[PDB]
Design a protein around this ligand. Structure first.
Ligand SMILES: CC(=O)N[C@H]1[C@H]([C@H](O)[C@H](O)CO)O[C@@](O)(C(=O)O)C[C@@H]1O
Ligand SMILES: CC(=O)N[C@H]1[C@H]([C@H](O)[C@H](O)CO)O[C@@](O)(C(=O)O)C[C@@H]1O
Ligand SMILES: CC(=O)N[C@H]1[C@H]([C@H](O)[C@H](O)CO)O[C@@](O)(C(=O)O)C[C@@H]1O
Ligand SMILES: *[C@@H]1O[C@H](CO)[C@@H](O)[C@H](O)[C@H]1NC(C)=O
Ligand SMILES: *[C@@H]1O[C@H](CO)[C@@H](O)[C@H](O)[C@H]1NC(C)=O
Ligand SMILES: *[C@H]1O[C@H](CO)[C@@H](O)[C@H](O)[C@H]1NC(C)=O
Lengths: 532, 532, 532
């Protein structure tokens, strides 16, 4: 055959055909298509600029580098989220504003398939796009899968508070990609009039963010947030960030006289000079000893008055705005093993007691952000339920998760519903087989777990039972359907109640059935404890 | 009450309220308002670029840094000139393009008070805006006072002689501030139709430079030059200025292949590296031995073809240009103590002889520019009188005070009158009680001594005698009056005649009154000796 | 009397009159006129931007800097080509985009003499326009002589094969210069409507590229490629250029993660650092050990997509374009010394047999580009004649000369004629008395030997036999004659047949007369071998 050559605004791109088991027309895969001028030099800590066009045929057939990050963390995370056979080894570089397209269309003849842009998670500190392969999700549901990349950590979120570096560069890059989709996805047999953005974790948050953003307007028509929203404190910083900006500055060896000089100096820094800082700053890790309130969690989404004019807990009160179908879901055990294992959570002891717990919950401030005077009544309502210690640890994990995703997700759901727009919700309760040999079997539906199903891992990786194969094949149809009509439902699929006043949702998994009031009892509990 | 918040073209500005004995209305003070994008990175050695708008409310409540300069030399000059009880220490930074504002207007009401933009002095090498508190002047004479900082030294006046680095970067910034006042001052209760500029020493010169510049036309409607004008050669480089550049580059450790390579190489140097280079050139201090010509004088205004299209001398010959009220005044003993005290002049024995005076005068070529074969002729007209070593040391000083300010001022003042525009001259004759201890109690009208009766020091510092209080209240009246109507006159004020054909001027002091033909004798003389 | 004062587009320029012994009309000489801004800092590896306008009278009285190149080599070349009295010492600089003018016109009036823009050669690595003095030519044939410069080595030809750095910067310069010519030459007595470009060696290839380039169209009306055309393989990089880039980047100490990264990294390096790399690569020198194929001889012309949309071999096949009188020429013994010497060829023995030559033509792969299976066929065709190991050398040399200048130059002529356009050819056969004392007297008409004739060296230097002086005149008239009407023929000059189907050319030397079929058997044979 002849490699597929799609004509774009900036030039002619070249991909490779990949036939999937059980299909006729192979899928044209494009890896490494630039969507914005490489953010190097004076372009560090600034909005993404349009990319220069090319003279011939760009052979975009290799995996683009992942934005600079913790190479060991990034490779680790890439190994736990991938859906393809073997994980792919990637490189780091400032030049990472790329994306990948998996169109199962017949380029020869005009096509207009729905598009599904995927925003990967990774706490805005790590992660990449190539990690997620759409091949299966593309062919199986006839949708063009697009995976984008955006600057991470310092590169994408360093902010001095003022205007010499408002911040949210990462989120501006996601918006920049979406713009590229709107202007190019058509030549790939996709439809710019039906783009659906969906993410998981940080990516999940980024989604909710772009939703409340005035910039992201008309760039998408449907959104999906998997485990993580905008009301998820940990990723959204509020208040005077100057201190954090200065703290990074000094660490890099930069005078702090004025924000202007600060930003200027960091521009004088190299990639390694900034990768070492990202390391010394120790992000994505809970610092035991030291006042919890001081511990810096991570550089993330901020209020720059551009991408986000106000905080999320503000924009949700207003109705006068653009609304679109929004699917928001969570997992049974978000804080089961993944996160803890990563952030090196102090649980090696086995069980936990009313006293010891109170400490962690407190020291976990950079995550749950809970006032010390609350820890007591907090641990009681959750762990105090039984004298059993082996259940305190579990209830502690179920607790830590209900604060980061539980209540938050539901609160975003109710408002979106109230705002006067289509709203759906789910709860993944399944344990993948592609998990790690080091993950306990007592943990079902951990963090991100739903991804394997969503990205049809059962069809790439081997050793998957027919049960799991049918599950994954199912969630893709729901997802795909939601992408099409904005309503997940269809023929051959269980009924998914629209999250309205009845507050019903779908329990996906072994037995995929509907249910009502998700974490309701819980939300209410925190709707007061968090109000003193 | 509630901190002052004003809306400017670039964003909101948060100020602070300050009260003053005798006035109910609290004066609003804004510190550190940026009138340009921090001239950093490649912006070095280039025109002032418009500031970037902030997205929220900028806190203009801190003292802005002063442009990089001799940290000690600069701090010292600030202690001396300051008009506040307690001097304020300052940080050094390249990011120094800011201005302070003092409005005695109620910002919750429409107000259009005349504006007085002050340009500090310091040989274009040192100085700052935060040094001069506008509080008194403003309240007392009901006007808006704006102290601005402009680029100094290398950063402000480094020229290669050509398009790769014209020069006068500092003068541009000055104008850059005027354009800021014209498009913003209206928000701080200022009338953009009555902007008056007034400087002292180096500031007095530049104020004259704007008067001859096309770029400044329509940015001010009244000017005041205190102890400094454009013909004051020292602060205006003439002839090929390339050599200076090459010697500045060489010192800084730069190549000198071409002009371009030169400018480009300095842009690469660091603030610390140029600051260390500024201290190697030894710019303020007057050398002793060696040949006067080889002696490196200083940087300064230059004929670039933008700010000035030709030497101040020529320019003053054409009246076809627009004209505005100009007030040019000097001080009885300009070279009395202040200047020498810093330049470490060879005065110590308290007495000077004929033979030595000629030798010294010559060693001051960078300050007077007189041929050694002429010195004899001059040293006679002044020192040919009484044969007393003491009266000589005092006469040799009145000698420099004439060749620096005296003659140059009057000629500038005379040429303005000849142009057909309102002119007013003055001579300060008073010794404030705010001087140092190392200052001889026999110097009446030292350099800058008016700066205490102009910025109402008697109402900010302690001790001020009623006489010294009555003086200050009188100058501020004349000054504000000039700024308002372009005429210093008003109620309860002696008559100040216009420097018309009768050549009348004012002798401000304990007992103020009008006179005639100020320094008319020396001018006539010095104009002749310069026959050659 | 007073220096010439011409007013160009970007400003006034001052030059100096210099008369040539004999001529009453003095020639106006200008040196160092910038036709582009200096490609320093961020403008490196980018297209030449228009020069910045100056405000006064720029003195064009010093020789401009020759672009960065090997200092030793750069001098050596300047010494073996210069036609002026005493060689001139030159400085290196990134800022070198300048051209020299030698107008013989009487600037006070309005003259429109023909203009000849000379593009100096040097392998696109070393060279300089100040080397060639045009006082003679401009005077003797009454024409405006121009000597333009253009980025070299890495600085003018580093390409990655993508938009991040397409390449051909040096060519893009030669163009920008030609443009400056069209918009300014008029004020120097020249006729922008009758421009004629010409250059030797790499300079010549540049002519052949402009003529074949669509951008170049309308920037000239006559062309002269002396010893070098666009079909001289060694100068035009075909295939994937990315490999060479990853080689340079690595030698300059850079990361090769992406092309966008390689460039950014090379832009940081100091001009001296890159020069180091230029000396590390070892260009212009024959790699005796290694792989003749992997041994990149020198980066150069490429098919960017801006200047060249396709290989010159695919361009000539299209008569659908703009045609202009072209004069292609070659010398009797091109690879007879100057080249074998500079490259340090192992022919110090003064002889060599077949088993050696066959091995030599191989290592010479970067020049001849002959396969390892053709070596015998080509060796047996040029050396299989005699057995005299000394005369087998002059044939091996003549061999390399035919594949680089011989055949190629002719094929270019045959294609220009056959495309319908005035074509002319010549073979210079003379040994100037200005040759190095190290060049054998047996080598006649070596690379560059015509220069001493074209620029009339016999009139600026001493020791010109009565014969040469005459030759130098004749060729000069021929040249200017071709610049005047695209026809070398005139009065008192041997008839020069147009290179039509009879393939008539002119043999220039001691005895000058036409001939037919130049290198006929040569182009034949060689096209056969290369047919694979
Ligand atoms: C340097 C490399 O090998 N990678 C490839 C890159 C990719 O675009 C980016 O790395 C992202 O995939 O550029 C090409 O695609 C191209 O423009 O022809 C070819 C090249 O092979
Ligand atoms: C030195 C400087 O100018 N930057 C300062 C700005 C100023 O508000 C604006 O610059 C206007 O002065 O913000 C601070 O004052 C602040 O309160 O956080 C600190 C910061 O150093
Ligand atoms: C500006 C510079 O530093 N270069 C030299 C120039 C050259 O003509 C070219 O502009 C650059 O070499 O000549 C000068 O004399 C001039 O008056 O411009 C100054 C200097 O010697
Ligand atoms: C600006 O000053 C106000 C006082 O009115 C204060 O509330 C605010 O914190 C200051 N800005 C910041 C973010 O420090
Ligand atoms: C410029 O050239 C003129 C030529 O006479 C000369 O008078 C002047 O001194 C030169 N300027 C410089 C660079 O010194
Ligand atoms: C790029 O890939 C295409 C498709 O196989 C191939 O034909 C071409 O030679 C390759 N060239 C580059 C740019 O690496």
């Amino acid at each position: 055959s002849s490699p597929p050559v799609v004509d774009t605004v900036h030039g002619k791109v070249l991909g490779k055909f990949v036939s999937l088991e059980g299909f006729a027309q192979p899928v044209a895969i494009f890896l490494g298509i630039p969507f914005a001028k490489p953010p190097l030099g004076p372009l560090r800590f600034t909005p993404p600029q349009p990319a220069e066009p090319w003279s011939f045929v760009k052979n975009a057939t290799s995996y683009p580098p992942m934005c600079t990050q913790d190479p060991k963390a990034g490779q680790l995370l890439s190994e736990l989220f991938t859906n393809r056979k073997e994980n792919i080894p990637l490189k780091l570089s400032e030049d990472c504003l790329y994306l990948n397209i998996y169109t199962p269309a017949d380029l020869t003849k005009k096509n207009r398939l729905p598009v599904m842009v995927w925003i990967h998670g990774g706490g805005l500190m790590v992660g990449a796009a190539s990690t997620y392969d759409g091949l299966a999700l593309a062919a199986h549901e006839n949708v063009v899968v697009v995976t984008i990349q955006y600057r991470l950590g310092i590169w994408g979120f360093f902010s001095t508070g003022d205007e010499h570096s408002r911040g949210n560069w990462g989120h501006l890059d996601q918006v920049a990609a979406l713009r590229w989709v709107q202007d190019n996805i058509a030549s790939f047999g996709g439809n710019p009039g039906s783009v659906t953005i969906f993410g998981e974790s940080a990516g999940g948050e980024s989604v909710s963010v772009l939703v409340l953003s005035p910039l992201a307007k008309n760039l998408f028509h449907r959104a999906i947030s998997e485990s993580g929203v905008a009301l998820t404190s940990v990723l959204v910083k509020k208040g005077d960030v100057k201190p954090l900006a200065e703290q990074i500055a000094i660490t890099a060896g930069c005078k702090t006289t004025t924000s202007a000089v600060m930003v200027h100096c960091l521009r004088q820094k190299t990639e390694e000079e900034l990768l070492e800082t990202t390391l010394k700053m120790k992000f994505l890790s809970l610092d035991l000893q030291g006042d919890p309130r001081e511990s810096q969690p991570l550089l993330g989404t901020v209020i720059d008055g551009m991408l986000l004019l106000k905080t999320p807990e503000e924009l949700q009160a207003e109705r006068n705005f653009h609304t679109v179908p929004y699917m928001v879901g969570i997992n049974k055990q978000e804080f089961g093993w993944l996160i803890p294992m990563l952030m090196s959570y102090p649980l090696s002891e086995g069980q936990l007691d009313q006293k010891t717990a109170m400490s962690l919950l407190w020291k976990s401030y950079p995550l749950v952000c809970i006032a010390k005077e609350l820890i007591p009544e907090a641990t009681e309502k959750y762990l105090g339920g039984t004298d059993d210690t082996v259940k305190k640890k579990d209830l502690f994990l179920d607790l830590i998760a209900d604060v980061m995703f539980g209540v938050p997700s539901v609160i975003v759901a109710r408002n979106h519903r109230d705002a006067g727009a289509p709203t759906y919700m789910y709860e993944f309760q399944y344990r993948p087989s592609f998990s790690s040999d080091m993950k306990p079997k007592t943990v079902i539906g951990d963090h991100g777990d739903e991804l394997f199903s969503v990205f049809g891992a059962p069809f790439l990786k081997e050793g998957a039972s027919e049960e799991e194969i049918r599950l994954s094949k199912m969630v893709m149809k729901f997802w795909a359907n939601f992408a099409r009509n904005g309503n997940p439902n269809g023929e051959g699929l269980p009924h998914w109640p629209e999250y309205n006043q009845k507050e019903g949702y779908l329990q996906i998994g072994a037995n995929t059935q509907a249910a009502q009031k998700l974490k309701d009892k819980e939300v209410a509990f925190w709707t007061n404890l968090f109000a003193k």
